[PDB]
Design a binder for this molecule. Sequence first.
Ligand SMILES: CC1(C)CCC(C)(C)c2cc(C(=O)Nc3ccc(C(=O)O)cc3)ccc21
Lengths: 10, 236
Amino acid sequence: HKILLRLLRX
Amino acid sequence: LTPEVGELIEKVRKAHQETFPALCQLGKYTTNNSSEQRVSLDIDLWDKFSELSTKCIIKTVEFAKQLPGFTTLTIADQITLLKAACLDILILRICTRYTPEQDTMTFSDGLTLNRTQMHNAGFGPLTDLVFAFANQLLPLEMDDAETGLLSAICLICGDRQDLEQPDRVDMLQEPLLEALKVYVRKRRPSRPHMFPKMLMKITDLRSISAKGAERVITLKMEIPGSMPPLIQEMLE
Ligand SMILES: CC1(C)CCC(C)(C)c2cc(C(=O)Nc3ccc(C(=O)O)cc3)ccc21
């Protein structure tokens, strides 16, 4: 979930 | 017309518009890759389509972060919502760029594929349902505000499995449904049947995306290498 998270996390 | 409703509509229309280039703004270009023959999977079409989908997933996440209250939910629930609505939003976006005369769909970089190429790129058995949905969508004459609201209603849905706070998501969706209802009546007052008709598209979208989840499965077997990282995260 990685990517996602990244993404997210913002 | 209400002050709170007008702001919600403006925010969602702006979120959609700023993450979605319209067909009219793009410079359409075609490719010769198996344009006339139907095959199980065209590798060159698949690489272009998989990369374009990856970019579109990034835009859908940017769109979600601009929807009011979305970033206030738990990270777990944002992830659950984005994964559940992923195919619904990509399909609604590709179908918004449908050209009936040539029977084509245009991607965000301008790549325009015909029915046979969409089939060969990876849609396969999904193709006629996606194109039928595009034809049903076209007469609705939706604008950025309505497409954006339909996308937000599909994403912010409390019925998704494994939601930590489904009632919180239900509450967040209610202002969007109300905003869509008044906007549809304010923009098109002569036709008051448009609002539940627009909501029927969401049911069709969920049906197409349920079949789409099965297509991810059959595609993983046909494609040479593994699925792109972000696609694997969203659909597995
Ligand atoms: C389920 C299936 C067949 C396999 C898995 C992936 C490849 C994720 C996929 C993606 C889409 C799709 O609609 N992608 C889009 C790509 C780009 C734009 C744009 O540029 O507007 C819009 C949509 C449809 C079906 C599938």
